[PDB]
């Protein structure tokens, strides 16, 4: 179960964040740690497509090779805080699992600049019991977290030392698919 009402960044710049480009997860913290594998990789694209606010997600377990993409149109709750009903798709946007009520995530941008971000998400997927997930993002998949984003982690009353890095997993991303999926 999720327990946090994450606070969005003061002054969040939506057009910069949702610019159509890719964000890579470099580090994550699940407050129910035993909810997600210790070795993982994930990335997303975020942008407006034909007037609609969109995200495209990619998940890859580097040990099991379990792979999936998602696309969602984000609904606005407040600036920097969204609710996203997702559909599982292949890399070309063909639907594998349609949108349905009860399959959604919340998404809060706690901090962002041009290169880095800190987000919170709470996933709801049917009857699974999932907890709060924080992720440090960067535009560069290999970037070490800098002081702006690590300070933001502190300001959220979190300890960056507890985050798990995704960097040592050889993950390789299909950026082209993530960008194109924004339209799907
Ligand atoms: C930007 C950040 C992330 C968002 C918005 C996000 C969103 C989601 C969504 C929507 C699903 C369900 C997909 C579907 O069934 O179609 C999912 C599943 C999953 N995510 Fe994430 N995720 C993110 C980061 C991560 C990270 C960093 C991990 C780390 C370990 C992770 C682990 C998982 C796992 C293991 C599942 C499969 C749940 C299951 O069905 O059993 N996610 N995520």
From Swiss-Prot:
Its main location: secreted. Gene3D superfamilies: 2.40.128.20. CDD domains: lipocalin_NP4 (cd19456). InterPro entries: Calycin, Nitrophorin, Nitrophorin_domain. Disulfide bonds join 2-122, 41-171. Salivary gland (at protein level). Heme-based protein that delivers nitric oxide gas (NO) to the victim while feeding, resulting in vasodilation and inhibition of platelet aggregation. Reversibly binds nitric oxide (NO). Also binds tightly to histamine, which is released by the host to induce wound healing. NO release is pH dependent and linked to loop dynamics. This is Nitrophorin-4. It comes from Rhodnius prolixus. One of its GO terms (cellular component) is extracellular region. Changing residue 55 to Q: Stabilization of the ferric-NO heme center. Keywords: Disulfide bond, Heme, Iron, Metal-binding, Oxidoreductase, Secreted, Signal, Vasoactive, Vasodilator. It is an enzyme of class 1 (oxidoreductase). Its EC number is 1.7.6.1. One of its GO terms (molecular function) is histamine binding. It is found in: Secreted. Heme binds at residue 59. GO terms for biological process: vasodilation. Binds 1 heme b (iron(II)-protoporphyrin IX) group per subunit. Its cofactor is heme b.
């Amino acid at each position: 179960a999720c327990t946090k009402n994450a606070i969005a960044q003061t002054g969040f710049n939506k057009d910069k964040y949702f610019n159509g480009d890719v964000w890579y997860v470099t580090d994550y913290l699940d407050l129910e740690p035993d909810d997600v594998p210790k070795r993982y990789c994930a990335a997303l694209a975020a942008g407006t497509a034909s007037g609609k606010l969109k995200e495209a997600l990619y998940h890859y377990d580097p040990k099991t090779q379990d792979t999936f993409y998602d696309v969602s149109e984000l609904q606005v709750e407040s600036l920097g805080k969204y609710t996203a009903n997702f559909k599982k798709v292949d890399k070309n946007g063909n639907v594998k699992v349609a949108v349905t009520a009860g399959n959604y995530y919340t998404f809060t941008v706690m901090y962002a600049d041009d290169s880095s971000a800190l987000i919170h998400t709470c996933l709801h997927k049917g009857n699974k019991d999932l907890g709060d997930l924080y992720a440090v993002l960067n535009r560069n998949k290999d970037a070490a977290a800098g002081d702006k984003v690590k300070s933001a982690v502190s300001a959220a009353t979190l300890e960056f030392s507890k985050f798990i890095s995704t960097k040592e997993n050889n993950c390789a991303y299909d950026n082209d698919s993530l960008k194109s999926l924004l339209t799907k």
